[PDB]
Symmetry: D2
Subunit: 121 residues, 4 copies
């Protein structure tokens, strides 16, 4: 299992120690408070009131936690995934990222604390 | 495992099918949007800026998801619990509740969706 | 999880720390060599050639590993059980026992090494 | 998970669907009766009284269940492995084999039933 922090101002994202292999079932739980700019802070689902101005993930709100598995596209994580299997045969290392517009991560603050484990299969 | 919804307006909370027994390890993932009165909505960690005016759980913000195991006191859940083990002596059915001040749930709205399962131990 | 030894000459059985509760899924793996009397030894399935002369469990051979769950009758374990659910209405502490005729354990030797865990549910 | 049978007279062994990846935790439970030649049968720990005359796995008795993981040497399985992690730099598909001397499998009989699953990690 992996336990770590994902900083909201890190545009490259946080590489974890988890490799997602074919057939793996995983569980993620995320908590904490971060902002894409404003003084207010939001949790791992982000800000449902902010429009999408070119987010790295169009299926999650600005300020949400998202991930990539290997060379996949971005996949929403939000507060977590329960006993989840990756669709479409994706595989590889798990990278966690804060959902913002590329080039605008410099004014971001806060972080999420994230647990990832593999389930029985 | 159990999956279900917990309404923000329900002072009685939502009884699940999960009975927590001594030594159990559990994982909970919660998601969704609710409000304790305002037009804005918050996720399962609640509103970090709002004062405690007599919440059912003083260890979580107003608007957070909390639980009871049997006749325990309230326990914060927030966005979830990863491979968690209860304090000594706690046992019984898990009831999920929205954290507000008793008598004031009448202006609350929305709901959280919650998954619970038992882990290997 | 519990790991320990079950001595072949212990007629009372070895009480483990595992309490089997309704809904639990368990895995057991047993190993080792034991005898009910002869100089030869057998593994946890026991001796398929020996007759049942009053065994504490009639559904397993003499010299097999069996168990009781609380006050239940005996249940065969043999080499182990994979992600197993107990009959309804049995619960309580798991006791592990070598299968011999009562009164006749004094000439037994050897032991089984046994591991028990609870699985995801 | 994988469930199947390992035949005592199959010298090549049985390639399963389980790929052991770095960091995996696995559980194997084996049961049944087989022989390496004699009329008598033994369980998955084989025959502790039989000399090693060139076994594929010198770390297990003749008639035991063993495995290979990818490019590994043979590894004893016996009655099973509980929540087991492989040595460093062992990975690949799990092949299960009956322990006998090469060229002497033709007179073997019986089989073991085997369950393999991945555990939480
Ligand atoms: O839409 C995203 C965008 O939102 C605000 O304008 C922030 O100030 C920017 O840094 C950027 O995060
Ligand atoms: O502090 C709790 C309190 O918050 C606001 O005042 C709401 O209008 C009330 O219904 C109550 O929820
Ligand atoms: O069948 C049970 C019986 O088998 C042999 O006779 C042993 O010597 C006895 O002690 C008893 O274990
Ligand atoms: O030691 C191995 C050897 O044991 C006996 O001799 C069997 O007859 C042979 O087929 C071979 O299995
Ligand atoms: Ca920004
Ligand atoms: Ca209210
Ligand atoms: Ca005896
Ligand atoms: Ca042979």
């Amino acid at each position: 299992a992996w336990k770590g922090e994902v900083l909201a101002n890190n545009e490259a994202g946080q590489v974890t120690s988890i490799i997602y292999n074919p057939g793996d079932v995983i569980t993620i739980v995320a908590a904490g408070w971060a902002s894409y700019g404003p003084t207010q802070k939001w949790g791992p689902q982000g800000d449902r009131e902010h429009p999408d101005q070119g987010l790295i993930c169009h299926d999650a709100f600005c300020g949400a936690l998202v991930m990539k598995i290997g060379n996949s596209g971005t996949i929403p994580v939000n507060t977590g995934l329960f006993r989840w299997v990756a669709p479409n045969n994706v595989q590889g290392a798990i990278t966690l990222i804060y959902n913002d517009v590329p080039g605008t991560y410099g004014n971001n603050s806060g972080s999420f604390s994230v647990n990832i484990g593999k389930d029985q299969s």
